[PDB]
Symmetry: C2
Subunit: 164 residues, 2 copies
């Protein structure tokens, strides 16, 4: 049992799907669990795909950088889609060390302890339209290190202040 890695780019270079399509497809094909670590999450199309996964019964764990969490909240409000009322979705925040806000500068998407997308793509309009980025699609043994990291992050996460 080794590790396999494909590179994807935005803009695309020698692969048929954009990074965003690949994300939406990875969410679409989730069977059991989605673990997401994201710095900024405002992309409505990716959000919808996640909500939909949850309604099929997939458990979804999301960890967001605390300092940008408001941009996610704003987006969920616009979508008339309160994350607290969705029973299969947990969302917690992670911060770094303050001095100036320390941040969780990590991002990745993990599905079913089977596939990871790891890279520089944030779930925002601007990464679809403006930014250059790259990700890895990872399968095999190294996905276990992404579980351990996700669990580790989750262990240090807080319930966002908005939730009473």
């Amino acid at each position: 049992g080794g590790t396999h890695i494909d590179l994807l780019f935005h803009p695309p270079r020698a692969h048929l799907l954009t990074i965003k399509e690949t994300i939406r497809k990875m969410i679409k094909e989730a069977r059991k669990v989605i673990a997401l670590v994201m710095d900024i999450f405002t992309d409505v199309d990716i959000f919808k795909e996640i909500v939909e996964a949850s309604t099929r019964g997939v458990s979804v764990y999301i960890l967001l950088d605390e300092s940008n969490f408001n941009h996610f909240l704003n987006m969920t409000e616009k979508q008339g889609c309160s994350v607290q009322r969705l029973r299969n979705i947990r969302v917690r925040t992670v911060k770094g060390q303050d001095y100036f806000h320390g941040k969780m500068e990590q991002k990745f998407l993990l599905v079913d302890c089977q596939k990871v997308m790891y890279g520089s793509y944030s779930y925002m309009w601007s990464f679809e339209k403006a930014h250059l980025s790259m990700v890895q699609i990872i399968t095999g043994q190294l996905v276990e290190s992404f579980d351990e990291e996700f669990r580790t992050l989750y262990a240090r996460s807080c319930v966002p202040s908005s939730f009473a």
Copy 2:
């Protein structure tokens, strides 16, 4: 010929060096070539290590996000260490698509077509002190895909405006 990957964290988790020490060590041990793709580069200790590599005769190619390039220039000026007068160092900028500045959201360090550090760590004080991040140390076949990507980026880079 496969690929090998180790994960490093900041803060450190089960490895002896911090990400910053590992960077400085990778630069220290460079023999021939350093290729760096960086979103923001203001860390004086990493800069010094690069200058020093260059004076030993290592060719250094740096690609920086255009929109943050001024922060690098400012730092080099403070250090009394003009990058244009250093014969072994080339620096070019890369931008994304504008609308709001599109950015090069990619970063990695490549040494000698042998080792890559790929991850969320930017070469700034704040990643040593405040931010949570992670990188991969990559060796083996996948390093060739980082050459191709670096060459591709380099092909799309511009001479910064400051250089006449």
